[PDB]
Amino acid sequence: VHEFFYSLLLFDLVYREETLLNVIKSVTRNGRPIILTAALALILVYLFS
Amino acid sequence: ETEQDKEHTCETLLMCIVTVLSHGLRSGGGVGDVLRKPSKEEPLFAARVIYDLLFFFMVIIIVLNLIFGVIIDTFADLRSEKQKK
Amino acid sequence: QLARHNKELQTMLKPGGQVDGDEALEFYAKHTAQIEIVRLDRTMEQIVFPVPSICEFLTKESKLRIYYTTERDEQGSKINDFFLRSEDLFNEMNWQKKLRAQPVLYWCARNMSFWSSISFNLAVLMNLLVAFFYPFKGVRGGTLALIASTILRLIFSVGLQPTLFLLGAFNVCNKIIFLMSFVGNCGTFTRGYRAMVLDVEFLYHLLYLLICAMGLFVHEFFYSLLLFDLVYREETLLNVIKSVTRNGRPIILTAALALILVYLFSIVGYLFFKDDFILEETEQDKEHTCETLLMCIVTVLSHGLRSGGGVGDVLRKPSKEEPLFAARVIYDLLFFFMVIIIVLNLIFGVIIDTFADLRSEKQKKEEILKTTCFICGLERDKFDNKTVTFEEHIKEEHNMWHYLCFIVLVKVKD
Amino acid sequence: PVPSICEFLTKESKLRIYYTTERDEQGSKINDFFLRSEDLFNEMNWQKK
Numbered sequence: 001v002h003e004f005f006y007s008l009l010l011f012d013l014v015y016r017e018e019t020l021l022n023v024i025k026s027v028t029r030n031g032r033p034i035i036l037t038a039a040l041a042l043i044l045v046y047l048f049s
Numbered sequence: 050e051t052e053q054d055k056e057h058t059c060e061t062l063l064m065c066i067v068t069v070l071s072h073g074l075r076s077g078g079g080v081g082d083v084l085r086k087p088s089k090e091e092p093l094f095a096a097r098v099i100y101d102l103l104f105f106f107m108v109i110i111i112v113l114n115l116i117f118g119v120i121i122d123t124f125a126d127l128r129s130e131k132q133k134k
Numbered sequence: 135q136l137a138r139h140n141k142e143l144q145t146m147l148k149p150g151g152q153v154d155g156d157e158a159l160e161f162y163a164k165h166t167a168q169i170e171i172v173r174l175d176r177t178m179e180q181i182v183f184p185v186p187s188i189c190e191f192l193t194k195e196s197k198l199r200i201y202y203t204t205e206r207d208e209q210g211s212k213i214n215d216f217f218l219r220s221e222d223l224f225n226e227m228n229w230q231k232k233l234r235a236q237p238v239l240y241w242c243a244r245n246m247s248f249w250s251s252i253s254f255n256l257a258v259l260m261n262l263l264v265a266f267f268y269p270f271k272g273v274r275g276g277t278l279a280l281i282a283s284t285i286l287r288l289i290f291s292v293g294l295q296p297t298l299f300l301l302g303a304f305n306v307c308n309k310i311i312f313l314m315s316f317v318g319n320c321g322t323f324t325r326g327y328r329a330m331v332l333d334v335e336f337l338y339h340l341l342y343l344l345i346c347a348m349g350l351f352v353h354e355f356f357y358s359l360l361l362f363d364l365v366y367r368e369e370t371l372l373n374v375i376k377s378v379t380r381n382g383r384p385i386i387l388t389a390a391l392a393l394i395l396v397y398l399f400s401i402v403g404y405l406f407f408k409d410d411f412i413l414e415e416t417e418q419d420k421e422h423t424c425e426t427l428l429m430c431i432v433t434v435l436s437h438g439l440r441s442g443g444g445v446g447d448v449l450r451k452p453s454k455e456e457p458l459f460a461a462r463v464i465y466d467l468l469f470f471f472m473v474i475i476i477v478l479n480l481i482f483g484v485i486i487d488t489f490a491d492l493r494s495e496k497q498k499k500e501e502i503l504k505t506t507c508f509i510c511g512l513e514r515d516k517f518d519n520k521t522v523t524f525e526e527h528i529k530e531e532h533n534m535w536h537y538l539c540f541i542v543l544v545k546v547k548d
Numbered sequence: 549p550v551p552s553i554c555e556f557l558t559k560e561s562k563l564r565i566y567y568t569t570e571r572d573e574q575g576s577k578i579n580d581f582f583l584r585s586e587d588l589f590n591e592m593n594w595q596k597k
Contacts, residue, residue, distance in 0.1 A: 026123040033370045034119050040375075041112040043365055046265070047358055048104050049070045063268050064278075078441045088418055098433055105440050106389075114482045115374055122489040126497075134571070505574070515574060524574065 077113070080105045164190070169540050170531040180531065186546065188227045189539035196223055197535055201503065210511040211502065216538070222326030224542045229321045242315040249312020253342075254364045255279055256308065259286075260301050261361035264354050269295045302350040302357075309343045377488040385484050392477040399469050400435045403449070407462060409434075410450045442478070445470045508534045553592045561588055 014020065027034070061069040073083035081101030087094050136143035149159050165185040172179065200223070205215035233239055259282050267273065275290070289297030316339060320332065342363055349356020365371065378385070411434075413422050426434040438448035446466030452459050507514045510532055518524030565588070570580035 022127070025127060026120055029127065030119065030123045033374060034116060036365075036371055037112075037116055037119065037374055040365055040371060041108065041116065043362055044108055044112060045070055045074060046067055047362060048108070049067045067265060078443050080440075082441065086414065086418060088414060088420055089424060090418055095430075098436075102436055102440060109442075110478070110482055110485075111378065115377060115485060118377065118482075118486050118489060119374060121486055122493060125490055126493065134569075519574070 074108070077109070080108060167533070167536045167540065168531040169536065181540075183540070183543060186539055186543045188224070188231075189542055191227060191230050193227075193230070196227070200538075201508075201534065204499075204503075206499070206502070211509075212511070213509055216509065216534070218327045220538045220541050222328075223538060225324055225326070226320065227542070229324065233318065233321065239314075239318050242311075242318040245311050245315040246319060248308075249315060252305075252308040253312065254367070255282055256301070256305050257357075257360045257364045260298075260305065261354065261357045264298070264357050267294070269298065299350075302346065305360075306343070306346050306350070309346060313339055313343065373492070376492060377485055380492065381484065381488045385481060388477075388481055388484065392473065392481065395473055395477060396435055396439060397432055399473070400432045402465070403435065404431050406465075407449070407458075411448060439473070442474070445473060508532055509537075553589070553596075556592060556595050558592075558595070561592070 069083070070080070073080050076083070079101075081097070081104060087098065136146045140146060148154075149156075167182055167185070168180050169182060170180040200216070200219055203215070203219065204211050207214055267276070273294075285301075289300060316335065323332070323336075326332070342360065345356045345359050347356075349360070409425050409427060411424060411426070414420065414424060434448070435445070438445050441448070444466075446462070446469060452463065505514055506512065507518065507528065512518060512532075514524060518527065565581070565584055568580070568584065569576050572579055
């Protein structure tokens with residue numbers, strides 16, 4: 001196929017080894033609030049909308 | 050017609066008004082700027098100037114930074130557990 | 135009474151544990167308190183008396199509410215808080231059984247769960263659906279949290295303005311039912327110590343209902359406002375908005391420090407600089423001439439404040455001209471630097487400060503909830519570690535629930 | 549004296565165990581160690597065959 005399959009393998013390579021894992025735990029471990037926090041933004045763009 | 054081109058007329062009236070504001074949300078700068086042409090006109094000029102400023106302040110700093118604000122909180126939480134451990 | 139000495143008492147303890155299922159022994163399970171209090175001085179007593187019936191009826195909420203609610207008023211999160219709570223708690227516990235006297239309300243406790251379900255799910259779907267399709271145009275499905283999908287199909291057949299009306303009515307009925315469960319849970323509007331909570335709850339729920347009624351009879355603005363409340367509830371979205379409210383006094387006046395930095399600077403740009411913005415009957419159109427000279431010069435700089443980028447850029451055309459070119463270049467750079475970073479980031483700067491303040495209080499407070507003892511001021515670890523045990527002397531004698539049911543038995547008899 | 553399986557080992561066992569831990573309760577105590585130990589014994593035998 002057109003590489004899309006190749007690019008996706010590169011994405012996993014950057015995910016591994018070490019403390020790049022640390023900085024992405026910033027958005028995942030306490031990851032529950034921010035996606036609903038975005039809906040507080042999505043309604044502030046709405047009501048004002 | 051040949052290509053995706055109009056004689057400069059869109060006029061989002063009724064449908065997806067949350068997207069045409071999301072059209073202006075995407076530039077970060079301003080918010081109200083996408084809508085345009087206030088132009089001194091007395092019963093509406095001072096009527097919306099304040100509105101755009103209010104919108105801008107609130108949306109951008111308040112959310113587009115507290116959506117960043119939670120992220121650094123998740124650093125001082127996350128490292129301090131590791132350095133205590 | 136067999137406590138301090140028996141080997142046979144150890145065998146009584148054998149009565150006590152070991153999975154021998156005998157009802158009398160189990161029933162004590164109903165009570166074993168070991169209250170463990172002091173008199174005026176000289177003393178380290180423990181007293182016991184069986185449980186009181188009202189306490190036995192309970193809830194689940196009482197224990198939960200009490201531990202979490204606390205306070206830390208003084209040198210230890212001591213009894214003051216507990217005492218106020220206890221008085222209110224006793225009165226609240228009695229109300230429960232004469233609600234069991236009239237059984238058609240208990241469904242109302244189940245509706246304490248439902249209020250939530252309907253209102254939250256219903257509102258968002260309805261408000262979003264309104265946004266998705268504005269009425270008065272005849273339209274198909276138009277391609278351009280379980281029961282609601284079923285309802286969507288049914289409403290879809292008959293015409294969809296019709297569906298909108300019906301949903302609003304449905305919502306009102308649901309509101310009435312849950313409302314009833316909130317009131318059922320605390321009855322007679324019985325009074326305690328916390329005035330704010332009860333009053334706000336009554337009002338808030340009423341306000342939530344009214345908007346629905348107004349909306350049924352107006353362009354939804356009433357519908358959208360109900361969606362705003364739905365996003366406000368449940369949980370830690372409340373946390374991140376306390377960042378801007380608890381330490382909320384300074385930032386609104388901090389904004390006026392920005393509002394005067396746009397002002398003082400605003401004035402110079404008047405005197406040492408003409409306006410220099412030219413390029414902006416049937417329609418709202420001019421032949422490219424505004425020239426804000428005299429009136430609202432703080433707004434035409436606020437016109438440039440709004441883009442964030444630059445500041446001076448809105449004014450325009452410096453163009454190499456010697457007595458003024460180097461004269462204002464520095465001015466715009468100075469303005470830009472100062473206003474934007476300094477305020478438009480310290481107005482953000484205070485916000486993250488209100489995170490490291492706000493969480494650190496909460497993470498310290500759990501450490502004084504899980505790893506200090508409850509009310510004996512006990513530095514739970516070393517001291518408790520050396521003896522019989524730590525953890526079960528929470529469960530045996532310093533039981534915070536076992537104090538308060540001893541307090542309610544003081545008004546029983548004769 | 550030591551037991552032979554333990555003597556065969558790896559390098560991973562020691563590393564994994566210390567770092568892995570837990571802090572479950574009043575001290576990062578033995579609970580964690582015990583679960584890990586059982587799994588570890590089985591893993592160590594697999595090495596010689």
